[PDB]
């Protein structure tokens, strides 16, 4: 019924542990508090961004420092703060525990477990605001991170160390894309090779708790949690956690990245981080800017997303791939935060509701979506088969709009319709890189020109299955040599 060891022995261990040494330190006093902010007089030696210990285990961070007082943001449980309470220096800037124990665990932006599965053994600690890799500490992005999505992998390829923005209206498949990308790393994880493994961090900011639970279940079913960590700042969390969670996830990922591992970090979503930071800044009475946002919101996102990088061989060659999510409003990408983040990242995948409703799933808007790494983030076979797919589809959409014809125009329209049908893909159905190569080969070389449009999908499916049933040497060759040999092309 009970081991009677932890339940009883925990207190004995704790009493043997409470050294409770006398400490000489500066104490400040809370002078006013409310709405998640607190002003503290005293603490002459406090640092900027220092962590502050309020009574009852409440933590804050010193953000405003002037002669009168210190304006601090409370990181949860702000209702226990009262005027006159004693505030204690911690002597450290914001930092979180990091290590391999975080894989498969749900933690809050302080690194504390919230899954209720017991303490986490931390390899070390890491400050949240350590500098990003410099220009001379990086190397070109040259390793493909396979999302398993034909549209993304063939038209907006993502390399290791890249920041690809998933931006779109609500209910357009952004989280679907990110979760499928995480799940597609299962095959690489099982190989056991740290050069191929991708460890995933999923930061949920301002999400409803049950939706975070749904994501965690989707990951558990696909075996993703074996290599995935979740940093949760649900909608009920203090604005401090919402503002801080992406940095916590970035630190956890950076610990692995600097140790030669490859990391994929998803932020779902940075719009809510920006909202939380605006709330904090307004409560601290810092002057507002456009849309009442603080002047340094672009800095907030840029310094976060610049730590997703591909490191040079001298630093171990690890990487952290960023997949920030942005929720646009009424499909307007001209808003403040979407424009900032778009200008920050290494390309974007625009998901549109009109395309989604038409059956184009994932609803990538080909014309405006782009990857800024390009072919460098693809294997040779994918580059060859999908060399000019994005521009071909842009031309096809333009010509489709114009046509509301010449023989060449009709041929172009047919080829574009077939390619559009080809790029459609259900959810939770990843394609290995070789299967993607073969499908795009069918589309682009013209082998679908003899198939009815509404049949393309089915055809594709069946043909791939055929190649798996027999003639499997084609997939093996593509997977091994990373290129389709002309002999394999003929076969």
């Amino acid at each position: 019924t009970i081991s009677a060891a932890d339940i009883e022995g925990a207190i004995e261990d704790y009493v043997s542990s409470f050294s409770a040494d006398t400490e000489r330190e500066e104490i400040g006093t809370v002078i006013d508090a409310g709405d998640g902010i607190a002003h503290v007089e005293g603490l002459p030696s406090v640092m900027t961004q220092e962590l502050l210990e309020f009574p009852g285990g409440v933590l804050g961070v010193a953000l405003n420092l002037d002669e009168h007082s210190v304006g601090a943001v409370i990181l949860g449980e702000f209702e226990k703060i009262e005027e006159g309470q004693q505030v204690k220096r911690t002597g450290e800037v914001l930092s979180v525990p990091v290590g391999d124990a975080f894989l498969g665990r749900v933690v809050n932006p302080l690194g504390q477990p919230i899954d209720g599965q017991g303490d986490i053994a931390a390899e070390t600690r890491r400050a949240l605001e350590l500098q990003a890799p410099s220009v001379v500490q990086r190397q070109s992005v040259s390793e493909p991170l396979q999302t398993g999505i034909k549209a993304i992998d063939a038209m907006t390829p993502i390399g290791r160390g890249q920041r690809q923005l998933i931006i779109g209206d609500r209910k357009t498949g952004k989280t679907a894309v990110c979760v499928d990308t995480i799940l597609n790393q299962r095959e690489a994880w099982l190989t056991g090779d740290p050069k191929q493994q991708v460890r995933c961090v999923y930061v949920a900011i301002g999400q409803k708790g049950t939706t975070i639970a749904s994501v965690k279940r989707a990951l558990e079913e696909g075996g993703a949690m074996e290599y995935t960590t979740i940093v949760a700042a649900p909608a009920s969390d203090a604005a401090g956690f919402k503002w801080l969670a992406p940095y916590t996830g970035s630190a956890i990922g950076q610990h692995w990245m600097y140790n030669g591992k490859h990391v994929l970090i998803v932020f779902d979503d940075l719009s809510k981080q920006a909202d939380a930071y605006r709330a904090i800044s307004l409560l601290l009475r810092r002057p507002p800017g456009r849309e009442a946002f603080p002047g340094d919101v672009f800095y907030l996102h840029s310094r976060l997303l610049e730590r997703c990088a591909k490191l040079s061989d001298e630093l171990g060659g690890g990487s952290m791939t960023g997949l920030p999510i942005i929720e646009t409003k009424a499909n307007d990408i001209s808003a403040f935060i979407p424009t900032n983040v778009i200008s920050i990242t290494d390309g974007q995948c625009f998901l549109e509701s009109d395309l989604f409703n038409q059956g184009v799933r994932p609803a990538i808007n080909v014309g405006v979506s782009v990857s800024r790494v390009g072919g460098a983030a693809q294997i040779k076979a994918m580059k060859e088969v999908a060399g000019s797919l994005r521009l071909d589809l842009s031309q096809y959409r333009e010509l489709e709009a114009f046509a509301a014809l010449d023989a060449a125009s009709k041929a172009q329209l047919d080829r574009g319709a077939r390619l559009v049908e080809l790029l459609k893909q259900p959810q939770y159905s990843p394609l290995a890189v070789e299967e993607q190569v073969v499908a795009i080969f069918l589309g682009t070389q013209g082998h679908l020109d003899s198939v009815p449009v509404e049949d393309v999908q089915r055809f594709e499916s069946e043909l791939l299955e055929h190649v798996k049933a027999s003639h499997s040497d084609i997939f093996d060759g593509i997977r091994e040599t990373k290129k389709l040999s002309e002999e394999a092309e003929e076969k």
Partner: protein, 469 residues
């Protein structure tokens, strides 16, 4: 003495000075007295901020008209609390928990503070189970989740409250659990009508009503939802009952919060809303949830200011919902009821893994047809369908019939039109819309599909109009 005194009064917000060491904790309830004859009352103030120098800024739950600087303020030592238990069922309460229909009732009940943390994350369990309503559009395109969170967005006068009444009729009547209705910043006469109707339908005995309506200070309007939520939380946690939580209107809670924030001296956020808009929304909404083994099916009406779905309030509300029915002024103008926007409404359980392949395929085909119809609206508005190709003409006729058929004579609409409502089984809805998409009713007139139930009603109305099915 350990009592405070009023130092500033600015609308429903009052600053109270306390002796050092007696400053009330945040969210504590304080009591003051207004003595002027007509407005004599006992103000309940909620501590909102600590200003320093032993001053606290508090939100009044009643109008502060007649309050005088310097009057004594007493600290009750606890936050606002409301009665809980099976005794609250069948009765009408205000935000503070006073019983309106039977004044003095419930004073001896157990009282729960209206402020509490949401359930622990490890206790949350995602809910994927369709709650069938009998409404074709809801069942087909935006299926509701039993134990999930449903919202009905809409501008002014598009049918949010009528749809809430419809869902009370369809879900709450044949319900074995408890229902909690929270009227928040809505018409008082609507509350009286709901009370009378529930008594008439013998649903009141299983329902607890909590009303803080338009003619209330913003503090009451932003705490009444917490009071009703506390009653629902007691039913969920302390009794293991299935709970139906109806809220109308949650945007009023947000707007009252905005007014309070303006009074408190906070710097406004975008569109003049409070800086802590998303956070207040999040705390309230994440208290509304089904834990593991304990079900709350919450349905909330969300007002959309000036038909602006981009407004920060509904925009931040969207993220907290399992199913979203977005009512449209455009659909309302066409006479289609319920005025659901099929292309804007959504549900998290409309996927083949949960609703089956047939339901999913039919719904996706309906959505595709309607989307293609919406894309052509530019050409049609200028030139009509005559310029469209044969394929587009056929799709347009099919889409017009589909959009008519998504309408339904609702049960709660009888009071308006005089026609009894109808219920449509889910299988019949799927089959009928499958036939519509295939084109097996392309010959009937459009009006044959307007405000009917299943295929039997379609055949009868077609016969009345001179067609044959």
């Amino acid at each position: 003495k350990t009592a405070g005194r009023v130092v500033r009064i600015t609308g429903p917000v009052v600053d109270v000075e306390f002796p050092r060491g007696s400053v009330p904790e945040l969210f504590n309830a304080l009591h003051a007295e207004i003595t002027f004859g007509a407005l004599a009352k006992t103000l309940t103030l909620e501590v909102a901020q600590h200003l320093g120098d032993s001053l606290v800024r508090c939100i009044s739950m009643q109008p502060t008209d007649g309050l005088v600087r310097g009057v004594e303020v007493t600290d009750t030592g606890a936050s606002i609390s409301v009665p809980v238990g099976d005794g609250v069922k069948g009765h009408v309460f205000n935000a503070l928990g006073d019983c309106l229909d039977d004044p003095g009732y419930g004073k001896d009940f157990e009282h729960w503070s209206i402020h509490r943390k949401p359930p622990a994350f490890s206790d949350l369990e995602p809910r994927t189970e369709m709650l069938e309503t009998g409404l074709k559009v809801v069942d087909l395109l935006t299926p509701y989740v039993r134990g999930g969170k449903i919202a009905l967005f809409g501008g002014a006068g598009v049918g949010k409250t009528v749809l809430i009444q419809e869902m009370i009729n369809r879900i709450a009547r044949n319900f074995g659990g408890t229902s909690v209705f929270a009227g928040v910043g809505e018409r008082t006469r609507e509350g009286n009508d709901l009370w009378v109707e529930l008594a008439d339908a013998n649903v009141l005995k299983d329902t607890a009503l909590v009303f803080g309506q338009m003619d209330e200070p913003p503090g009451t309007r932003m705490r009444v939802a917490l009071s009703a939520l506390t009653m629902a939380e007691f039913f969920r946690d302390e009794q293991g009952q299935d709970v139906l939580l109806f809220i109308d209107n949650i945007f009023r809670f947000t707007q009252a919060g905005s007014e309070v924030s303006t009074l408190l001296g906070r710097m406004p956020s975008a569109v003049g809303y409070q800086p802590t808009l998303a956070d207040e929304m999040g705390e309230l909404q994440e208290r509304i949830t089904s834990t593991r083994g304990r079900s709350i099916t919450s349905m909330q009406a969300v007002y959309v200011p000036a038909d602006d779905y981009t407004d920060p309030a509904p925009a931040t509300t969207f993220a907290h919902l399992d199913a979203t029915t977005e009512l449209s002024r455009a659909v309302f103008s066409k006479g289609i009821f319920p005025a659901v926007d099929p292309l804007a409404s959504s549900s998290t359980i409309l996927d083949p893994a949960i609703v089956g392949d047939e339901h999913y395929r039919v719904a996706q085909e309906v959505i595709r047809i309607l989307q293609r119809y919406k894309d052509l609206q530019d050409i049609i508005a200028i030139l009509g369908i005559d310029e469209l190709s044969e394929e587009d003409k056929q799709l347009v006729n099919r889409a017009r019939r589909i959009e008519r058929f998504l309408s339904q004579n609702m049960m709660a609409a009888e009071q308006f039109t005089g026609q009894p409502g109808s219920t449509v089984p889910l299988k019949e809805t799927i089959e009928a819309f499958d036939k519509l998409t295939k084109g097996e009713f392309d010959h009937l007139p459009e009006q044959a599909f307007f405000l009917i139930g299943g295929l039997d009603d379609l055949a009868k109305k077609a016969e009345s109009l001179g067609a044959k099915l």
